[PDB]
């Protein structure tokens, strides 16, 4: 399956260089998709305390992450008309927050496609060509 | 009359220094509002034909105006977690699309507040404090 954008720094919204390149690939994929497909960039966090940062809440942290990924997709030519962003904060974890390994799973941004039934095949086919050799 | 933001020309998404000042004023207001109130930044166009611009459709234009305004609101300190943007293209004109003057009222971005009955008063006096005798 396709990978989400993982934030290794549990308390920041910083997009490093490896992640920028990956966002760029997804951007290239997105612009090839039919125009009636929209993209919702969703933001998540673990439950690491936020005390020594600027963020008041995990929602706020996840919003910044999703917004920033969205910003980057636009940088690489995705039309703002196909885009939106959402924050789920520390709700909806992939894994429980017991260990460092599982907490990384929770520090991510996920891409959601909004598509009809016919455009779903096209997305499927386009994603297959670019991601699986 | 708390006015929308009105763009300079039919096909432009440029935010002039005039509009910057006004968006900043709006950002100050938003930051005084209760945390449970959210802000949707709505973009519109007139129905001026789009040749000789980058934009392929009015929704792309309207989406770009609204995204830009939101990006500015954040720039001036508004929590991304309280923000979203929407494009309405040339739909929902506030005025008939005849004279240039009227077409321009349609080239605009509007701010919608999402609020419960109780936070509605808190928003009223905050807005009144800022835009009335």
Residue numbers in the entry:
A (entry chain C), B (entry chain B): 119 to 251
Original authors' sentences:
The motility protein B (MotB) is a key component of the bacterial flagellar motor. It anchors the MotA/MotB stator ring of the motor to peptidoglycan (PG) of the cell wall and forms part of the proton-conducting channel that couples proton flow to generation of the turning force via an as yet unknown mechanism. The PG-binding site of MotB resides on the periplasmic C-terminal domain (MotB-C) which shows sequence similarity to outer membrane protein A (OmpA) and related PG-binding proteins. Although the PG-binding grooves formed by these loops are topologically very similar in different OmpA-like proteins, all five conserved residues (Gly161, Asp164, Leu179, Arg183, Arg226) that are thought to be essential for PG recognition are buried and inaccessible.
The structure of previously unobserved crystal form (Form B) of recombinant H. pylori MotB-C was solved by a molecular replacement approach using AMORE. The asymmetric unit of the form B crystal contains 12 subunits. The overall fold of each monomer is very similar to the Form A structure. It contains a mixed four-stranded β-sheet, with three α-helices packing against one face of it, and the fourth forming an N-terminal extension of one of the β-strands. The three longer petal-like loops (β1α1 (residues 126–133), β2α2 (163–174) and β3β4 (207–225)) have been previously implicated in the PG binding by MotB and PG-associated lipoprotein (PAL). Structural analysis and calculations of the accessible side-chain surface area in Form A and Form B crystals of H. pylori MotB-C and in the crystal structure of the periplasmic domain of Salmonella MotB show that all five conserved residues are clustered on one side of the molecule and are completely shielded from the solvent by loops (β1α1), (β2α2) and (β3β4). The most significant differences are observed in the structures of loops β1α1, β2α2 and β3β4 at the PG binding site, with the following residues showing the largest displacements of Cα atoms: Glu126 (2.3 Å), Asn127 (2.4 Å) (loop β1α1), Val169 (2.8 Å), Lys170 (4.1 Å) (loop β2α2) and Asp216 (2.4 Å) (loop β3β4). Analysis of the distribution of the main-chain temperature factor averaged over the total of 12 monomers in the asymmetric units of the Form B crystals also highlights these three loops as the most variable regions in the structure. Structure superimposition shows that there are significant differences in conformations of many side chains and the orientation of the main-chain peptide groups in loops β1α1, β2α2 and β3β4. Thus, our crystallographic analysis suggests that the flexibility of the semi-conserved loop region β1α1, β2α2 and β3β4 is important for PG-binding activity of MotB.
